[PDB]
Design an enzyme around this catalytic site. Structure first.
Site, PDB file in Angstrom:
ATOM      1  N   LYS B  59       0.644  -1.207   0.022  1.00 52.44           N
ATOM      2  CA  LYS B  59      -0.105   0.113  -0.023  1.00 52.44           C
ATOM      3  C   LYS B  59       0.846   1.235   0.017  1.00 52.44           C
ATOM      4  O   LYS B  59       1.678   1.419   0.895  1.00 52.44           O
ATOM      5  CB  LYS B  59      -0.682   0.058   0.934  1.00 52.44           C
ATOM      6  CG  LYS B  59      -1.564   1.352   1.301  1.00 52.44           C
ATOM      7  CD  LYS B  59      -3.033   1.411   2.231  1.00 52.44           C
ATOM      8  CE  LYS B  59      -4.083   1.200   1.251  1.00 52.44           C
ATOM      9  NZ  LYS B  59      -5.350   1.858   2.010  1.00 52.44           N
ATOM     10  N   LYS B  92      -7.892   8.133  -0.877  1.00 50.22           N
ATOM     11  CA  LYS B  92      -9.326   7.930  -0.571  1.00 50.22           C
ATOM     12  C   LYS B  92     -10.196   8.424  -1.830  1.00 50.22           C
ATOM     13  O   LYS B  92     -10.546   9.670  -1.438  1.00 50.22           O
ATOM     14  CB  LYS B  92      -9.821   8.186   0.632  1.00 50.22           C
ATOM     15  CG  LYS B  92      -9.094   7.689   1.852  1.00 50.22           C
ATOM     16  CD  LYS B  92      -9.322   6.339   1.871  1.00 50.22           C
ATOM     17  CE  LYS B  92      -8.753   5.283   3.105  1.00 50.22           C
ATOM     18  NZ  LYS B  92      -7.425   5.588   2.812  1.00 50.22           N
ATOM     19  N   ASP B  95     -15.415  11.320  -4.230  1.00 45.89           N
ATOM     20  CA  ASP B  95     -15.850  12.513  -4.830  1.00 45.89           C
ATOM     21  C   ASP B  95     -17.027  11.767  -5.530  1.00 45.89           C
ATOM     22  O   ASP B  95     -17.105  10.482  -6.033  1.00 45.89           O
ATOM     23  CB  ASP B  95     -14.763  13.100  -5.731  1.00 45.89           C
ATOM     24  CG  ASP B  95     -14.331  14.397  -5.003  1.00 45.89           C
ATOM     25  OD1 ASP B  95     -13.652  14.157  -4.121  1.00 45.89           O
ATOM     26  OD2 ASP B  95     -14.790  15.621  -5.329  1.00 45.89           O
ATOM     27  N   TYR B 210      -6.460  -1.477  17.081  1.00 44.47           N
ATOM     28  CA  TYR B 210      -5.861  -2.554  16.600  1.00 44.47           C
ATOM     29  C   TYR B 210      -6.249  -3.878  17.120  1.00 44.47           C
ATOM     30  O   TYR B 210      -6.773  -4.185  18.241  1.00 44.47           O
ATOM     31  CB  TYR B 210      -4.261  -2.853  17.128  1.00 44.47           C
ATOM     32  CG  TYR B 210      -3.332  -1.789  16.333  1.00 44.47           C
ATOM     33  CD1 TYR B 210      -3.392  -1.528  15.051  1.00 44.47           C
ATOM     34  CD2 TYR B 210      -2.864  -0.729  17.147  1.00 44.47           C
ATOM     35  CE1 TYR B 210      -2.803  -0.515  14.359  1.00 44.47           C
ATOM     36  CE2 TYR B 210      -2.056   0.363  16.751  1.00 44.47           C
ATOM     37  CZ  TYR B 210      -2.133   0.429  15.256  1.00 44.47           C
ATOM     38  OH  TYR B 210      -1.311   1.327  14.606  1.00 44.47           O
ATOM     39  N   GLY B 228       0.998  -1.322   8.896  1.00 41.85           N
ATOM     40  CA  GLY B 228       1.788  -0.031   8.805  1.00 41.85           C
ATOM     41  C   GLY B 228       2.746  -0.132   9.888  1.00 41.85           C
ATOM     42  O   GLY B 228       3.736  -0.808   9.881  1.00 41.85           O
TER      43      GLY B 228
HETATM   44  O1  LIG Z   1     -16.558  18.273  -2.425  1.00 39.81           O
HETATM   45  C1  LIG Z   1     -17.524  18.997  -2.552  1.00 39.81           C
HETATM   46  O2  LIG Z   1     -17.520  20.154  -2.873  1.00 39.81           O
HETATM   47  C2  LIG Z   1     -18.741  18.040  -3.281  1.00 39.81           C
HETATM   48  C3  LIG Z   1     -19.562  17.459  -2.632  1.00 39.81           C
HETATM   49  C4  LIG Z   1     -20.960  17.037  -2.985  1.00 39.81           C
HETATM   50  O3  LIG Z   1     -21.620  16.785  -2.418  1.00 39.81           O
HETATM   51  N1  LIG Z   1     -20.841  17.464  -4.113  1.00 39.81           N
HETATM   52  C5  LIG Z   1     -20.140  18.083  -5.176  1.00 39.81           C
HETATM   53  O4  LIG Z   1     -20.546  18.094  -6.468  1.00 39.81           O
HETATM   54  N2  LIG Z   1     -19.160  18.234  -4.711  1.00 39.81           N
HETATM   55  C6  LIG Z   1     -18.003  19.060  -5.676  1.00 39.81           C
HETATM   56  O5  LIG Z   1     -18.726  20.308  -5.997  1.00 39.81           O
HETATM   57  C7  LIG Z   1     -18.242  20.398  -7.640  1.00 39.81           C
HETATM   58  C8  LIG Z   1     -19.506  20.242  -8.432  1.00 39.81           C
HETATM   59  O6  LIG Z   1     -19.096  20.275  -9.923  1.00 39.81           O
HETATM   60  P1  LIG Z   1     -20.405  20.678 -10.779  1.00 39.81           P
HETATM   61  O7  LIG Z   1     -21.411  19.696 -10.557  1.00 39.81           O
HETATM   62  O8  LIG Z   1     -19.405  20.647 -11.924  1.00 39.81           O
HETATM   63  O9  LIG Z   1     -20.978  22.289 -10.365  1.00 39.81           O
HETATM   64  C9  LIG Z   1     -17.147  19.319  -7.858  1.00 39.81           C
HETATM   65  O10 LIG Z   1     -15.985  19.855  -7.517  1.00 39.81           O
HETATM   66  C10 LIG Z   1     -17.442  18.206  -6.781  1.00 39.81           C
HETATM   67  O11 LIG Z   1     -16.315  17.654  -6.294  1.00 39.81           O
HETATM   68  O1  LIG Z   2      -7.346   2.942   4.092  1.00 39.52           O
HETATM   69  C1  LIG Z   2      -7.035   2.063   4.567  1.00 39.52           C
HETATM   70  O2  LIG Z   2      -6.447   0.912   4.405  1.00 39.52           O
HETATM   71  C2  LIG Z   2      -7.420   2.108   6.230  1.00 39.52           C
HETATM   72  C3  LIG Z   2      -8.733   1.869   6.525  1.00 39.52           C
HETATM   73  C4  LIG Z   2      -9.119   1.812   7.698  1.00 39.52           C
HETATM   74  O3  LIG Z   2     -10.316   1.437   8.329  1.00 39.52           O
HETATM   75  N1  LIG Z   2      -8.045   1.925   8.686  1.00 39.52           N
HETATM   76  C5  LIG Z   2      -6.530   2.061   8.459  1.00 39.52           C
HETATM   77  O4  LIG Z   2      -6.037   2.051   9.351  1.00 39.52           O
HETATM   78  N2  LIG Z   2      -6.250   2.082   7.215  1.00 39.52           N
HETATM   79  C6  LIG Z   2      -5.138   2.599   6.868  1.00 39.52           C
HETATM   80  O5  LIG Z   2      -4.301   1.237   7.182  1.00 39.52           O
HETATM   81  C7  LIG Z   2      -3.142   1.735   7.528  1.00 39.52           C
HETATM   82  C8  LIG Z   2      -3.026   1.555   9.132  1.00 39.52           C
HETATM   83  O6  LIG Z   2      -1.644   1.931   9.475  1.00 39.52           O
HETATM   84  P1  LIG Z   2      -0.984   1.494  11.134  1.00 39.52           P
HETATM   85  O7  LIG Z   2      -2.061   2.074  12.191  1.00 39.52           O
HETATM   86  O8  LIG Z   2       0.167   2.198  11.046  1.00 39.52           O
HETATM   87  O9  LIG Z   2      -0.938  -0.176  10.727  1.00 39.52           O
HETATM   88  C9  LIG Z   2      -3.165   3.248   7.068  1.00 39.52           C
HETATM   89  O10 LIG Z   2      -2.452   3.594   6.027  1.00 39.52           O
HETATM   90  C10 LIG Z   2      -4.440   3.904   7.068  1.00 39.52           C
HETATM   91  O11 LIG Z   2      -4.786   4.871   6.393  1.00 39.52           O
HETATM   92  O1  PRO Z   3      -1.257   0.636  22.081  1.00 45.95           O
HETATM   93  C1  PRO Z   3      -0.057   0.897  22.223  1.00 45.95           C
HETATM   94  O2  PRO Z   3       0.177   2.223  22.168  1.00 45.95           O
HETATM   95  C2  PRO Z   3       0.878   0.211  21.593  1.00 45.95           C
HETATM   96  C3  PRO Z   3       1.127   0.349  19.985  1.00 45.95           C
HETATM   97  C4  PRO Z   3      -0.062  -0.316  19.262  1.00 45.95           C
HETATM   98  C5  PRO Z   3      -0.019  -1.606  20.185  1.00 45.95           C
HETATM   99  N1  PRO Z   3       0.524  -1.338  21.391  1.00 45.95           N
END
Ligand SMILES: O=C(O)c1cc(=O)[nH]c(=O)n1[C@@H]1O[C@H](COP(=O)(O)O)[C@@H](O)[C@H]1O
Ligand SMILES: O=C(O)c1cc(=O)[nH]c(=O)n1[C@@H]1O[C@H](COP(=O)(O)O)[C@@H](O)[C@H]1O
Ligand code: PRO
Ligand code: PRO
Lengths: 258, 258
Positions: B59, B92, B95, B210, B228
């Site tokens: 990842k 993530k 949009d 965790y 991670g």
């Molecule tokens: O992130 C946002 O502003 C967003 C949230 C939402 O519910 N709907 C939504 O359209 N937007 C954003 O607002 C803009 C809408 O674009 P238009 O449909 O082209 O006016 C885009 O940048 C979307 O990412």
């Molecule tokens: O996007 C993800 O994978 C994610 C989803 C979720 O529910 N929880 C979560 O921890 N992650 C990701 O998984 C990784 C977890 O990191 P550690 O807590 O360091 O093991 C990070 O990159 C988070 O962005």
């Molecule tokens: O809870 C803590 O702080 C440590 C780090 C994750 C697992 N144990």
């Protein structure tokens, strides 16, 4: 007892970023945010310069800017200062708190260095806000929480929306308001920004749904319209921005009343 | 009638990316995904080379890579091909459909050009998947939907999780599985990847929680652990990766039974 934008800018609990925004909205008579999802820095800058007087905010999309550099953002800041608008980056921060802070501060984009406002999804729980705040509060920034979405099948409804409101009202040192389709908080210190806005009825092919400025500001009680294609795809973007500005501003005045 | 990873790789409705992943998991005896949230390309590449044999997937976090270039990703692909692992970008996508497609294809990162897998939040509704698919299906890519999250206060529960499962099962030409804490789909063609994993109990200061490999793979029925800090913060990252690999692999074998 609904207060004008200029009076809301003075509320005791107002966030400094919200106050700056509300003051410029009142001064310029604009509650329009332009969403500028363009791939070329020249187009971004030319739009920001020409439409700057007409907007309170520019929503940037740096993830799609083919020729991004930090110097482009320095030039954008110069325009934002000149014309008086805030910079709101579109990036959807939506990770656990530990990871989101590095996304906001670091990498090549250094978003926190130039974005007045960012937005977060609330799905991870309040750690997303706490992580963003550890970078943004020292940098004097503000955040919007996505409480509702405009697109078909949105799951940001009901208890999800209520959780976003609770998260905002418990992190008021950093959260300045919402992306929503309507007023979702009764507290006037919070901004409501509404995307999914066009003058004409309709939608797109990928789930976007539109409502008018009059409906979203006037009936649904939001503060600011976010408009992308309704301006960006028009031939005369300045004229289009003025039509959206005048629509959103008059809807605000009419709801305020005497 | 639970099937091995190698047999799941041959299921009629399996996605080609899932099939490739499942085959290499079986061949290498690894169901470990390393989450490499590092800021330096040299560290990313040195980790991918040394830990490549021990992982089924890496990842990436390109939003935090200070010295990102597309050539770094070309070097990462060479390691992924050599050692046989997939590249899963963390961004993530969350949009409306129209906007997400440009985020996935474009900008400086060109994520779709090098990421085998991406992940999306389902909060916007199915347009997020339809937009991603218009780029990713031609590029032969796969997507994971975030059906549950590991962090305190997660709103990805109940009907939200059910909506993610429905969205996956209706976009099976592109969605290959889930980020979840447990098995959420009964269909064996879908992968379940579980973050929030450490050998020791606990959490972090910003909402991470965790559970162990034995719990998530063995009791909760997930397929792959995402780890991670449990690896990245250890002195000997190779040894740590091997401990996580052996934990997750044996948990899988014991659940499979005779
Ligand atoms: O992130 C946002 O502003 C967003 C949230 C939402 O519910 N709907 C939504 O359209 N937007 C954003 O607002 C803009 C809408 O674009 P238009 O449909 O082209 O006016 C885009 O940048 C979307 O990412
Ligand atoms: O996007 C993800 O994978 C994610 C989803 C979720 O529910 N929880 C979560 O921890 N992650 C990701 O998984 C990784 C977890 O990191 P550690 O807590 O360091 O093991 C990070 O990159 C988070 O962005
Ligand atoms: O809870 C803590 O702080 C440590 C780090 C994750 C697992 N144990
Ligand atoms: O619905 C449509 O297709 C056009 C574009 C949005 C408003 N009317």
């Amino acid at each position: 007892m609904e207060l004008s934008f200029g009076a809301r800018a003075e509320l005791p609990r107002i966030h400094p970023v919200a106050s700056k925004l509300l003051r410029l909205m009142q001064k310029k008579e604009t509650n329009l945010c332009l969403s500028a999802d363009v791939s070329l820095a020249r187009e971004l800058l030319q739009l920001a310069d020409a439409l700057g007087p007409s907007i309170c905010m520019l929503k940037t999309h740096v993830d799609i800017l083919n020729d991004f550099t930090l110097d482009v953002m320095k030039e954008l800041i110069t325009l934002a200062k000149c014309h008086e608008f805030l910079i709101f980056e579109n990036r959807k921060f939506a990770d656990i708190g530990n990871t989101v802070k590095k996304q906001y501060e670091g990498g090549i984009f250094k978003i926190a260095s130039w974005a007045d406002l960012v937005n977060a999804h609330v799905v991870p729980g309040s750690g997303v806000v706490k992580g963003l705040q550890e970078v943004g509060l020292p940098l004097h920034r503000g955040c919007l929480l996505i409480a509702e979405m405009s697109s078909t099948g949105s799951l940001a409804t009901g208890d999800y929306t209520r959780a976003a409101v609770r998260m905002a009202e418990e992190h008021s040192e950093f959260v300045v308001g919402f992306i929503s389709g309507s007023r979702v908080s009764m507290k006037p210190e919070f901004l409501h920004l509404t995307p999914g806005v066009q003058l004409e009825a309709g939608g797109d092919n990928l789930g976007q749904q539109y409502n008018s400025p009059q409906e979203v500001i006037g009936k649904r009680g939001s503060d600011i319209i976010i408009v992308g294609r309704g301006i960006i795809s028009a031939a005369d973007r300045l004229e289009a921005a003025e039509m959206y500005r005048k629509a959103a501003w008059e809807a605000y005045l009419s709801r305020l009343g005497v």
